[PDB]
């Protein structure tokens, strides 16, 4: 009987496995794009000529 | 626009709702696997019509 109890728990975790992987990959996409936005924005200073700005 | 046999489909929508209430797994997670599947498929037939 206890094997069936874990069987659903294992089945719940397999669906929780796939769900978090898509969740992590979107935040990893967003945390990348915020980071590469900030680091390129640190080049901004008044010495930049206006086309290069 | 080749071929769409909704006689095979609106049966298949209805049997998914039929097999939703019918199933006797005796477990608590398939019981909300099928309920989420079947409530989509019924609403899928409604929203198509």
């Amino acid at each position: 009987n206890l094997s069936l109890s874990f069987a659903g728990i294992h089945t719940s975790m397999v669906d929780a496995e796939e769900a978090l992987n898509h969740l992590d990959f979107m935040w990893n996409t967003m945390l990348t794009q915020i980071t590469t936005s900030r680091d390129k924005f640190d080049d901004i200073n008044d010495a930049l000529k206006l086309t290069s700005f | 626009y080749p071929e769409i046999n909704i006689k095979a489909m609106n049966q298949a929508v209805n049997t998914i709702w039929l097999l939703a209430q019918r199933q006797t797994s005796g477990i608590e997670i398939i019981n909300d696997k099928v309920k989420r599947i079947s409530a989509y498929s019924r609403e899928f037939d409604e929203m198509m019509r």
């Binding site: 719940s12 669906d15 929780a16 769900a19 898509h22 979107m26 | 989420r36």
Partner: peptide, 13 residues
């Protein structure tokens, strides 16, 4: 989107 509404249910299940 990638993270669908069925994904977030499966976690909350």
């Amino acid at each position: 989107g990638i993270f669908t509404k069925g994904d977030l249910i499966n976690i909350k299940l």
